[PDB]
Amino acid sequence: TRTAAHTHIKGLGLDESGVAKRVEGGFVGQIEAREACGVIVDLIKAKKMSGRAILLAGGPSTGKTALALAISQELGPKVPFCPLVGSELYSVEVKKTETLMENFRRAIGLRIKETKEVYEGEVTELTPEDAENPLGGYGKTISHVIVGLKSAKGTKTLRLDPTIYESIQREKVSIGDVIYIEANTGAVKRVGRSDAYATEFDLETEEYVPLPKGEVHKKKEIVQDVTLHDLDVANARPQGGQDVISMMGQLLKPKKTEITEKLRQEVNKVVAKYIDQGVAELIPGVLFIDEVNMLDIEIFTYLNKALESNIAPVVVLASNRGMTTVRGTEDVISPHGVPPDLIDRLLIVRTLPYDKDEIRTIIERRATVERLQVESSALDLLATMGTETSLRYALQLLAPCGILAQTSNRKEIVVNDVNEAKLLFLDAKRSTKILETSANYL
Amino acid sequence: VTRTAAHTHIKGLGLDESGVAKRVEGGFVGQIEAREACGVIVDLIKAKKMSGRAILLAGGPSTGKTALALAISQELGPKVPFCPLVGSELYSVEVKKTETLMENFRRAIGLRIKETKEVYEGEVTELTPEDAENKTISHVIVGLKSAKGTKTLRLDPTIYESIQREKVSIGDVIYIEANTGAVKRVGRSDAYATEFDLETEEYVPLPKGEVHKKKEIVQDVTLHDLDVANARPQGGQDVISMMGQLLKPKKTEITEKLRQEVNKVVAKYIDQGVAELIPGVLFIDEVNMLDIEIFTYLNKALESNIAPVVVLASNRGMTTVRGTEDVISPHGVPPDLIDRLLIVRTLPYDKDEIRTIIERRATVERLQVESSALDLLATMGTETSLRYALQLLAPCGILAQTSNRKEIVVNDVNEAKLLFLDAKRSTKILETSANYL
Amino acid sequence: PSTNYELCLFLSKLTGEPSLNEFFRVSTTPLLKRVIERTNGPKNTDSLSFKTITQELLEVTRNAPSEGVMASLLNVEKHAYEREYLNCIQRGY
Amino acid sequence: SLIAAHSHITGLGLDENLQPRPTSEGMVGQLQARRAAGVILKMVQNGTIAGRAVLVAGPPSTGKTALAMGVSQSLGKDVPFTAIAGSEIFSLELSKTEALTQAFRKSIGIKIKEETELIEGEVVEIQIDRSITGGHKQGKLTIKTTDMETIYELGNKMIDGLTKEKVLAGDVISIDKASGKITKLGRSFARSRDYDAMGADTRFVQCPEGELQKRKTVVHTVSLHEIDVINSRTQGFLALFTGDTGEIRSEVRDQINTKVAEWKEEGKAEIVPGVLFIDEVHMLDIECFSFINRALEDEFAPIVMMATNRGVSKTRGTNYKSPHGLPLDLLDRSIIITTKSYNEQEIKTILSIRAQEEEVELSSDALDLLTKTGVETSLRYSSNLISVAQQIAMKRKNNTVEVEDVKRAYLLFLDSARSVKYVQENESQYIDDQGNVQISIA
Amino acid sequence: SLSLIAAHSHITGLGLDENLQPRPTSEGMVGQLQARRAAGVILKMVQNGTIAGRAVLVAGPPSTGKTALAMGVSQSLGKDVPFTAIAGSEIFSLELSKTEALTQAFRKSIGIKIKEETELIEGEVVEIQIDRSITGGHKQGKLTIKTTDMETIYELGNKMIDGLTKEKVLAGDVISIDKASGKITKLGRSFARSRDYDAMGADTRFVQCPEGELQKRKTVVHTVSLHEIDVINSRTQGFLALFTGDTGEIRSEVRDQINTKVAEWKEEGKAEIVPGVLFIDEVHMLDIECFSFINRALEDEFAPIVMMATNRGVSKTRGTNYKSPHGLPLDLLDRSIIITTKSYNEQEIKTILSIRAQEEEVELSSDALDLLTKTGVETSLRYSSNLISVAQQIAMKRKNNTVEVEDVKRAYLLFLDSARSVKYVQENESQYIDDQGNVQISIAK
Numbered sequence A: 001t002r003t004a005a006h007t008h009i010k011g012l013g014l015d016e017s018g019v020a021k022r023v024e025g026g027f028v029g030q031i032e033a034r035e036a037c038g039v040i041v042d043l044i045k046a047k048k049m050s051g052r053a054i055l056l057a058g059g060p061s062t063g064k065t066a067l068a069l070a071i072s073q074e075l076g077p078k079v080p081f082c083p084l085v086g087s088e089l090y091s092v093e094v095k096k097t098e099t100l101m102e103n104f105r106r107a108i109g110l111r112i113k114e115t116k117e118v119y120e121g122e123v124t125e126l127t128p129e130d131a132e133n134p135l136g137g138y139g140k141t142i143s144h145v146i147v148g149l150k151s152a153k154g155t156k157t158l159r160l161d162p163t164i165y166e167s168i169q170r171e172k173v174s175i176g177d178v179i180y181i182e183a184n185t186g187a188v189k190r191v192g193r194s195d196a197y198a199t200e201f202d203l204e205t206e207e208y209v210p211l212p213k214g215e216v217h218k219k220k221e222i223v224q225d226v227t228l229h230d231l232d233v234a235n236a237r238p239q240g241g242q243d244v245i246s247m248m249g250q251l252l253k254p255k256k257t258e259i260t261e262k263l264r265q266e267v268n269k270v271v272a273k274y275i276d277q278g279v280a281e282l283i284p285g286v287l288f289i290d291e292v293n294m295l296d297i298e299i300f301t302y303l304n305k306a307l308e309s310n311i312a313p314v315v316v317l318a319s320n321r322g323m324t325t326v327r328g329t330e331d332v333i334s335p336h337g338v339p340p341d342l343i344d345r346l347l348i349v350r351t352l353p354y355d356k357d358e359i360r361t362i363i364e365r366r367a368t369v370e371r372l373q374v375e376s377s378a379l380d381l382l383a384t385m386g387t388e389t390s391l392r393y394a395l396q397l398l399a400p401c402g403i404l405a406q407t408s409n410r411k412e413i414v415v416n417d418v419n420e421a422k423l424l425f426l427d428a429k430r431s432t433k434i435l436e437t438s439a440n441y442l
Numbered sequence B: 001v002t003r004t005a006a007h008t009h010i011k012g013l014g015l016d017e018s019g020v021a022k023r024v025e026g027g028f029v030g031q032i033e034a035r036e037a038c039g040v041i042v043d044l045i046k047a048k049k050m051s052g053r054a055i056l057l058a059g060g061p062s063t064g065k066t067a068l069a070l071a072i073s074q075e076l077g078p079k080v081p082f083c084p085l086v087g088s089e090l091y092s093v094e095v096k097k098t099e100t101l102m103e104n105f106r107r108a109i110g111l112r113i114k115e116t117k118e119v120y121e122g123e124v125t126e127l128t129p130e131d132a133e134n135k136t137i138s139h140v141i142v143g144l145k146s147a148k149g150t151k152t153l154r155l156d157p158t159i160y161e162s163i164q165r166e167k168v169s170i171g172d173v174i175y176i177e178a179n180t181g182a183v184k185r186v187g188r189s190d191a192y193a194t195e196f197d198l199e200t201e202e203y204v205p206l207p208k209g210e211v212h213k214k215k216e217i218v219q220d221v222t223l224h225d226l227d228v229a230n231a232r233p234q235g236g237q238d239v240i241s242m243m244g245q246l247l248k249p250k251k252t253e254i255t256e257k258l259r260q261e262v263n264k265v266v267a268k269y270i271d272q273g274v275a276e277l278i279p280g281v282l283f284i285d286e287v288n289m290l291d292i293e294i295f296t297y298l299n300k301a302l303e304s305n306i307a308p309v310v311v312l313a314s315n316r317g318m319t320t321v322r323g324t325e326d327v328i329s330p331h332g333v334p335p336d337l338i339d340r341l342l343i344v345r346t347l348p349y350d351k352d353e354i355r356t357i358i359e360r361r362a363t364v365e366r367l368q369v370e371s372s373a374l375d376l377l378a379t380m381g382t383e384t385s386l387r388y389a390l391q392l393l394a395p396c397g398i399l400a401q402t403s404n405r406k407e408i409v410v411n412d413v414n415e416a417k418l419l420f421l422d423a424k425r426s427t428k429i430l431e432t433s434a435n436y437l
Numbered sequence C: 001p002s003t004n005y006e007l008c009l010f011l012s013k014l015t016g017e018p019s020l021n022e023f024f025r026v027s028t029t030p031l032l033k034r035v036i037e038r039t040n041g042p043k044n045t046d047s048l049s050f051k052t053i054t055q056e057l058l059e060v061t062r063n064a065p066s067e068g069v070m071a072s073l074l075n076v077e078k079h080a081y082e083r084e085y086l087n088c089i090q091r092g093y
Numbered sequence D: 001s002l003i004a005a006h007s008h009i010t011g012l013g014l015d016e017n018l019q020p021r022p023t024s025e026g027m028v029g030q031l032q033a034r035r036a037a038g039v040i041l042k043m044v045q046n047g048t049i050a051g052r053a054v055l056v057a058g059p060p061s062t063g064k065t066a067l068a069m070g071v072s073q074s075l076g077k078d079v080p081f082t083a084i085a086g087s088e089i090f091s092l093e094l095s096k097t098e099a100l101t102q103a104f105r106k107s108i109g110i111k112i113k114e115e116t117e118l119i120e121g122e123v124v125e126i127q128i129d130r131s132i133t134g135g136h137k138q139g140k141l142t143i144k145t146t147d148m149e150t151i152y153e154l155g156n157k158m159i160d161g162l163t164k165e166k167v168l169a170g171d172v173i174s175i176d177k178a179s180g181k182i183t184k185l186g187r188s189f190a191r192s193r194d195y196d197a198m199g200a201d202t203r204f205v206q207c208p209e210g211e212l213q214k215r216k217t218v219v220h221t222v223s224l225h226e227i228d229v230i231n232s233r234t235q236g237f238l239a240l241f242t243g244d245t246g247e248i249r250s251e252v253r254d255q256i257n258t259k260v261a262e263w264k265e266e267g268k269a270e271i272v273p274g275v276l277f278i279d280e281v282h283m284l285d286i287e288c289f290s291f292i293n294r295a296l297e298d299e300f301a302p303i304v305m306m307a308t309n310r311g312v313s314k315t316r317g318t319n320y321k322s323p324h325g326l327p328l329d330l331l332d333r334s335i336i337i338t339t340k341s342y343n344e345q346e347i348k349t350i351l352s353i354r355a356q357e358e359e360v361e362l363s364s365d366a367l368d369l370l371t372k373t374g375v376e377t378s379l380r381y382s383s384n385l386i387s388v389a390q391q392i393a394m395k396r397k398n399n400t401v402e403v404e405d406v407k408r409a410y411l412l413f414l415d416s417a418r419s420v421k422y423v424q425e426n427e428s429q430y431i432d433d434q435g436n437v438q439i440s441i442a
Numbered sequence E: 001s002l003s004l005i006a007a008h009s010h011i012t013g014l015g016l017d018e019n020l021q022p023r024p025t026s027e028g029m030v031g032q033l034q035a036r037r038a039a040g041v042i043l044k045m046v047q048n049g050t051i052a053g054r055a056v057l058v059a060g061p062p063s064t065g066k067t068a069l070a071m072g073v074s075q076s077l078g079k080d081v082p083f084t085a086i087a088g089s090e091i092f093s094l095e096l097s098k099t100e101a102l103t104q105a106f107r108k109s110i111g112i113k114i115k116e117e118t119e120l121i122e123g124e125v126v127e128i129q130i131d132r133s134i135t136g137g138h139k140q141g142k143l144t145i146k147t148t149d150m151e152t153i154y155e156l157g158n159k160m161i162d163g164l165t166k167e168k169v170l171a172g173d174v175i176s177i178d179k180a181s182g183k184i185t186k187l188g189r190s191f192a193r194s195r196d197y198d199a200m201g202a203d204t205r206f207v208q209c210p211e212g213e214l215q216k217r218k219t220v221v222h223t224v225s226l227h228e229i230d231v232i233n234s235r236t237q238g239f240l241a242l243f244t245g246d247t248g249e250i251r252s253e254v255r256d257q258i259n260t261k262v263a264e265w266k267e268e269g270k271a272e273i274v275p276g277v278l279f280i281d282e283v284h285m286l287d288i289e290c291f292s293f294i295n296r297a298l299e300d301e302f303a304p305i306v307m308m309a310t311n312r313g314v315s316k317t318r319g320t321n322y323k324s325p326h327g328l329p330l331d332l333l334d335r336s337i338i339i340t341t342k343s344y345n346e347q348e349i350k351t352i353l354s355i356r357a358q359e360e361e362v363e364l365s366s367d368a369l370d371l372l373t374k375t376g377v378e379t380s381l382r383y384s385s386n387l388i389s390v391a392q393q394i395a396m397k398r399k400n401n402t403v404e405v406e407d408v409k410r411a412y413l414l415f416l417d418s419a420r421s422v423k424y425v426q427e428n429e430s431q432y433i434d435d436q437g438n439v440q441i442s443i444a445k
């Protein structure tokens, strides 16, 4: 078990058709922001809209990323979620517009149901039966291939096409191997050798797979979850070109290229065609961009362009700046570092700072998650610590308090332990104070 | 007739066995304290114990910082590696600058490997491959022959593959290296030169010496050579390719994993006694051209366990550091790096040692200068600059030679001063004139 | 492998190569010669080399008939070739 | 697909006299700009006028891109419409002028007529002769209809298309000769001898009658940029989707221009022009503006529509300010369409259209409150509030959206001015332009 | 053997007790008791391995031992634990973005331990007898592998024969074959069968014939970082990019798939996660984009403990135009804990100088140690530490073993510190090139 300043956040914690409980789901306070995020989660689950932008605005250490992760856990693992930093779009292999568009396409998922009818198992015989009056000038003209497959409780003799036989030569299928044939394509697949057929007792490099379970003939419905960016990446590269430059690019570094809009529209129209047949289901997800103040003005204008498309997902933005200059500009003072046209294109959810009791309950919840026992007086001192200093400093001081408690052979965290941890590790404000007082290039 | 560069006249630091600098010795005159400090530095290098030691040579222009660096280079010898570099060379457009600095760091740590070279040279008399199947040849019996006699060898099928690569037949003088396995076809012998009156064969003589020749050699490599030997995005350094490969290999950021593996292999070979480790010198002239990021990576890389002795040169004073905006620092070097340096101060000269520098450069370039012409050149060196006289020495010799004289006279110095200008006179002409000189 | 057997064993545990001499052979061959001579059939299952999702979608449609949903979702370049009549377009340059 | 911001616009809403209706085809108001856009659309549909610059100017949230999407919807099919933003030009693998040239040539279409033989019939016999390694492939195909039966010679590509989607005898298939398309219509024989290999369940198709070969003329549109990318290198068709078309030489462009002029003069092909729309055209550099100035004077130059929402602003790449962010030599070559703001009634009609498109039922007083909020703050803010108010109303288990749902959505999600006021009242809680913030509560 | 004496070679770890209380002088670390106790608390958190992504900022004036404390933490951490010490300037690259370089630095500092069991048959090949099958399937072979002591016969399958014919192994070749996995190697040619050929081949390597038991059991523990798995799964032949370094911006979906597969391999127990420390020395030389990516990347469960070192005061953050404490923005300092290092008094300077002189095998006299301590208190620790070795060379040129006062005084006269060089430059400013480029090379007017 590992904790990473999260994983106490288990969803948002709203009840059905109602007001958020104050302490529920690892969340303390932020009732209006959690209600707005629940409304956004229901809008995403409605599966109807495209390119809706929410900006989480508040101070530092107020729970914007916690709310985004709560949205992601409320949506479930099947709905796609792409976390992102504003600094990640400045790639040096491809232009920043292409990175933004591929992160947009990474947050649109496709669920495809399909039927696989297969014959698999350990093989018993391979008789390429010759035809009567077998032409002339050729040896062993095959009328059909008889393959005897066996598995757990099942044994089936199959009369295959002659043209599978060269595939038999292709995958090096011998008697005693565990093979796998799809009915629609008729392509064999040598999984390995049976465990009972380990004849070479001394030295062998074969992969001995167990004998597969169930009947030989199995027809099953499987569900595959992909993203639209996966389809774009798989369709961009030459799929089995079998030429010199294809293997050259296979062996080379996979450099990122500007995926054209034509390929995206082709993928979109084939996806819509298979959606109309009912075999595929489209799900939109969340592209979360934290600290969008690091985005360039070109990123903001391309965001204005790309939010109007019919495909784009719900984009959750976060920012902690209040009234600052937009990156890429020199005199554009804007709220949250976001230009007014994009600000016009989104909805703003405000996040509030916390109180003493909320900070105390957050510290106690983090102590219970990290499996640390803190007494009440040390908890009150940590709450006063989190009010005088930052909340994150009091949250991150819990683990040194646990180390200093366990080094004295006790499980409770004592006021002496948190005083020692205060003396050992410094706050940002106290470090700034001793940087101002000391003029020795500290 | 040998050419003469700017630092040709300097052969060493000119110190005695006690380390005290003789005044005029080794191509130097004056600058005794910095020469003694550089002698202490080369004693530290010859100790072969320390790593990451850094010395900065600080002084004015034309005072001898680069002269002392090349004097260190001749004092150590060609066995010790020496990597001269400019601070401008670290700005590469193929790889990042810290990677280039670390590559130049690894270029100044060398290895001596004693090895044998055994060569079979001569004309093939018999080429019988024995198969002994178990299609595939067991071995090949090859009979070479030179003017001192013949010799028979048994060769593995890899050398037979290399022999059939070279289209070797009976009667061809060929070359075989026993250790490497390289096969080179020198060409057909003249004993078979009259089989046809005209053919594309190149007819070479029989070797006059013995067939088998063995000698001892030493291989001087660096750690950067072994780094780039086994870090190739597209391999194939072994095959001889006159034409280039179809895809141009680019310089890449070599990871620390390859450095640790190369260090482990080198330490294993050193522990066997095969290889000897020679720490060397990385010299960076004009260190004020380094970016602050390169200064930070230099701060990090000077604490390595395999870092060489680094010698920096600078001629600036209280100057802003490159890549910064308001960091006024001595010699253009940030104060965190300066704390790790040892600073050797380089003094200016006066008239007498300027005159002896001029006469030493005249003696090295084989020019005869008259005494009053030497005094005029020394006065001009004190007035304009020392390098102005050092660069006007050769036009004086040319103007003397065109007048059929082997002795430089005062009129030659006046004519060379009239024809060629220094920086101050050209700046005065620049200031007085209006339309772009 | 004579001097650095531990690194070869580590790389064989990582990649799953059945031969420990594959790394020395690959590192000392030309890249085009390596591209021509890559016919490798078996791989070790007990390895850290993993089969990606997109590579699985490549493998299922290596030999697959048309009108299957997985087959047609990953074969769109051929569909764009066929529907734009690029089989009979004349050369211009 | 999904509901985007311009999904309600199905055209321009103009009569045959180029007169705009007050509300038609999802467009309401902006009569002079709609009439000017209809004039531009008729100029595009004429096709004899090349390289005209059109600028659409106005404040934000007014309808410049709405007018461009109305032009695109009224443009018709097989006419190119390349809608890009100003940030796509700045690339790492292409120059600005080369990216602009590719955007210009993506907007010019070439309508090519091809002659095609359609061969539909039952397969009697397939004979395929392949080499030992499988490289060289040839053979014969005996095909049949109810009148006559022929034997054709198969090439490599036709056999490759026959192996995939495996054609047996008795299968009714269709052969497109000009495209190499193999379409298995089905199976007509239903032989008693059935193999155990295949899982094919092909439907019964009646035996095709009539002639076997049918001649037809097909018509397809290919952009200019596709022809330069295809003719630029060997595997240019891969580069049409990967976008690895790095700086195509001018010799290729000149030869493609001469070849398409020869195709026009032969009657084989015709050239149709399209529209290059550039949203946020102020983001382009002065070098891009100079290249646009000289590239508008070409024969193969499309109609260029540009949209910007900026007044006298700083032109990028320079040190001065210009109207619309564009230099005066570019504005000399352009005719400017001006778009004006809306009143209460136009905002109410836009919100009613957006609610009808989003399947959201609004009451009269809820629509009045949304209209008042759109007038006070922004039209985009109320149009975004519609969906979350619908989500709140569905959370309240009622079908329609009431006034209190709109008030709850207004209280939950902030606009620009309220967020600016909240930031200015709580300035110390946010990171300012100097990077100073007070995280601590006390 | 290859490593020479560096600036931090005398430090073998943090000199702490079992109660995390630092000794005054232990394991090469002198003083800094609060900083060493805090670093011991940091080490225990890394050793616990149950929490992730803590940012620790080591701050103080230069030459106080922030990097010394980091090397003490790395030495006390022990082997087979990923410690990645990088500088802030290495992030700025040409084919990798700053966030991608930071991701590769983060994922190089956390790995997995994997246990392997090897049944190795190592020996020289005597004879390979191949039972040629009529149909060609299941080609039986008889391997005569042989050590110095004893020799058996092994049965060989068809894929075994194909592996032994893929690489060219003959009689007299030393090979080892794994029984469990079928791994193939060729160590080279035995020395007993080395004189039969007059010239060796290009790939012919000569190795000693192994002794002892023919088949040996061994347990191998492999520590594979997450970046290693990313580079391996990024390409078809990805092991070359582990050494050449041209990984080239590994896509995200590979990293999520590898994270999920590492989680399920942990839950089925064939690998265990070993977290480590990423130490960014001079972290002030990073862009604000790097700081924001660090802020978001510290919140993942596969994140190491990040130790950052800075000697800056209230300095300008790179990429912006405002000043900030430590050269770091306030949201980065919010998610961090600060260990402050203080300056040294005379006794700590003397003890560190004596330890550094003992490390370099220099016999310092008492008066020379007092003079070096006075110079260290006056100028700097690193100036006296650099003066020790050149004073040793000065004394060795004087045919003396130990150093005296005269050797240290000669080294002080020959080599200048920062303040003396600043004084000599400021006294003669015309002889040096100014910030405006002006200089006076002429010595007379």
Ligand SMILES: Nc1ncnc2c1ncn2[C@@H]1O[C@H](COP(=O)(O)OP(=O)(O)O)[C@@H](O)[C@H]1O
Residues within 6 Å of the ligand: A005, A006, A009, A026, A027, A028, A029, A030, A059, A060, A061, A062, A063, A064, A065, A066, A067, A320, A362, A392
């Ligand atoms: N209401 C809350 N309840 C519980 N934990 C919270 C709450 N708000 C913030 N936190 C915790 O505080 C820590 C820092 O908050 P974070 O979301 O990183 O701030 P920011 O919004 O500036 O990114 C997170 O680990 C988060 O889990």
Ligand SMILES: Nc1ncnc2c1ncn2[C@@H]1O[C@H](COP(=O)(O)OP(=O)(O)O)[C@@H](O)[C@H]1O
Residues within 6 Å of the ligand: B006, B007, B010, B027, B028, B029, B030, B031, B060, B061, B062, B063, B064, B065, B066, B067, B068, B315, B357, B387
């Ligand atoms: N002490 C000296 N004795 C002899 N020659 C010298 C001395 N100092 C400098 N020189 C000569 O002066 C020339 C220029 O000096 P240089 O080392 O280039 O100056 P800098 O230190 O600015 O690089 C060199 O060719 C060198 O040979």
Ligand SMILES: Nc1ncnc2c1ncn2[C@@H]1O[C@H](COP(=O)(O)OP(=O)(O)O)[C@@H](O)[C@H]1O
Residues within 6 Å of the ligand: D005, D006, D026, D027, D028, D029, D030, D059, D060, D061, D062, D063, D064, D065, D066, D067, D307, D309, D350, D379, D380
């Ligand atoms: N005449 C109109 N008819 C219908 N909707 C309109 C009209 N004008 C503007 N809109 C709506 O107003 C919103 C903003 O218009 P848009 O053109 O996208 O941005 P801008 O006007 O700032 O360029 C769009 O969502 C669009 O649907």
Ligand SMILES: Nc1ncnc2c1ncn2[C@@H]1O[C@H](COP(=O)(O)OP(=O)(O)O)[C@@H](O)[C@H]1O
Residues within 6 Å of the ligand: E007, E008, E028, E029, E030, E031, E032, E060, E061, E062, E063, E064, E065, E066, E067, E068, E069, E311, E352, E381, E382
């Ligand atoms: N506590 C200590 N114990 C031993 N040596 C130290 C100590 N602190 C500093 N040093 C020595 O001082 C030198 C410079 O310290 P360094 O680690 O570079 O400090 P900083 O990183 O703050 O510049 C190092 O070479 C180290 O040997």
